[PDB]
From a paper:
We have solved the X-ray crystal structure of Cc Hfq to 2.15-Å resolution, including the structure of the entire length of the Hfq CTD. Purified full-length Cc Hfq was crystallized, and the structure was solved using the Ec Hfq core hexamer as a molecular replacement search model. Four Hfq hexamers could be modeled in the crystal asymmetric unit, packing in an unusual arrangement with the hexamers positioned orthogonal to one another to generate an “open square”. From the electron density maps, residues in the short CTD of Cc Hfq could be visualized for several protomers within the asymmetric unit, in some cases allowing for modeling of the entire length of the CTD with a high degree of confidence. On modeling the Cc Hfq CTD, it became apparent that these extensions pack against the CTD of neighboring hexamers in an antiparallel manner. The Cc Hfq CTDs that are not directly involved in contacting neighboring hexamers are partially disordered. From the structure of Cc Hfq, it is clear that the acidic tip residues (DADD; residues 78–82) pack against the positive rim residues of the proximal face (R18, K19, and K21), with few direct contacts to the arginine patch on the distal side of the rim (R49 and R50). Specifically, aspartates 81 and 82 are positioned to make electrostatic interactions with lysine 19 and arginine 18, respectively. Finally, glutamate 75 from within the CTD forms a hydrogen bond with arginine 49 and serine 39 on the neighboring protomer within the Hfq hexamer. These interactions agree with the proposed autoinhibitory mechanism in which acidic tip residues pack against conserved positive rim residues on the core of Hfq to compete with nucleic acid binding to the rim and disfavor spurious RNA annealing events. The well-ordered CTD–rim interactions observed in our structure suggest that the short Cc Hfq CTD may provide even stronger autoinhibition than the longer and more flexible Ec Hfq CTD.
Residue numbers in the entry:
A (entry chain D), E (entry chain B): 6 to 82
B (entry chain E): 7 to 73
C (entry chain F): 7 to 74
D (entry chain C): 8 to 76
F (entry chain A): 7 to 69
The structure:
């Protein structure tokens, strides 16, 4: 159904998992994903939410393991 | 409507002061006065410059908004 | 016209002296004489220079431009 | 294609990889999932979404076997 | 007819104008454009030809003034 | 056909050694054994490496 990005982003948003965003320029932002579309992610931190462009993000690391139902390495996609 | 349009229209309609963080580590301050698919018009101290969305990494409003 | 087209066509038709700030911090000065989907022709006096917009951070006019 | 064959191969084989990013930092782990824009790198109990647009190279620790046209 | 990029590249190719291609990472390439497509430019320097990707190009500087037939500032393009 | 396809197929068919310059300054050497729309497969000394075109600045062949 959903791809890898939508599954990952919807999962960490529905579970409100604390995250760490590693921007390509080395800046690190923390918070939770409250909303995302095709080009950006809305990061909520305390009461302040900031828009982060996907094109500026390198990695998104959850603070705790998150259930993504990743495909098994025994069969194809 | 999506998140980016809602966010940008909100911070525009509300004259919200914000901080544009660029991918090169440069910070910009001002108010978004106009935006399209690829850029935004940031006004500060009466001077408005064209900022390209691929140069923007984050947009942080000084006062939060909602939707 | 959209924001980008209105801004670029106005500083072009008006020959507004500009300062293009690149993503690598390099500053370019001149006047836009032509632009398309990806590039911008920056000419300062007798010299031409094709500037790719993906390398542009911000464009700041030397004088405030009335865009309407 | 090449990218899909390579990524599927190192995924199904769970090959230990080293992902070099454009900003120079090095990532170690196994690719468990990938789409058109991102790659899911698993190391220990950690899962890290990595965007393809920020990757420079992907090199496997052990040699990979691919069938080319 | 042609847009700015196609006019610029075809002109410096047809006239074999010596160029200085500035990359985003600060390094400067010199030579003559012998061929180009939507994403790449083949720069020739002596008898060496190297593929230059447009996504790494910041500016392109011709060594001499080049005729481009730019639009007049008095009318709309 | 297109320049990039012609250039890449040429150095692949002839197995010409080349130097891949990345946008972060790193230099890679090897032979292109396979490529698609977004990546190339650079092989050197039996080790194959998936290189993303969007990270490449220039490709200079040795010959």
């Amino acid at each position: 159904k959903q791809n890898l990005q939508d599954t990952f982003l919807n999962s960490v948003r529905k579970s409100k998992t604390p995250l760490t965003i590693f921007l390509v320029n080395g800046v690190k932002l923390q918070g939770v994903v409250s909303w995302f579309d095709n080009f950006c992610v809305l990061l909520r931190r305390d009461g302040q939410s900031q828009l982060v462009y996907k094109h500026a993000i390198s990695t998104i690391m959850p603070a705790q393991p998150v259930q993504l139902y990743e495909p098994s390495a025994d069969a194809d996609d």
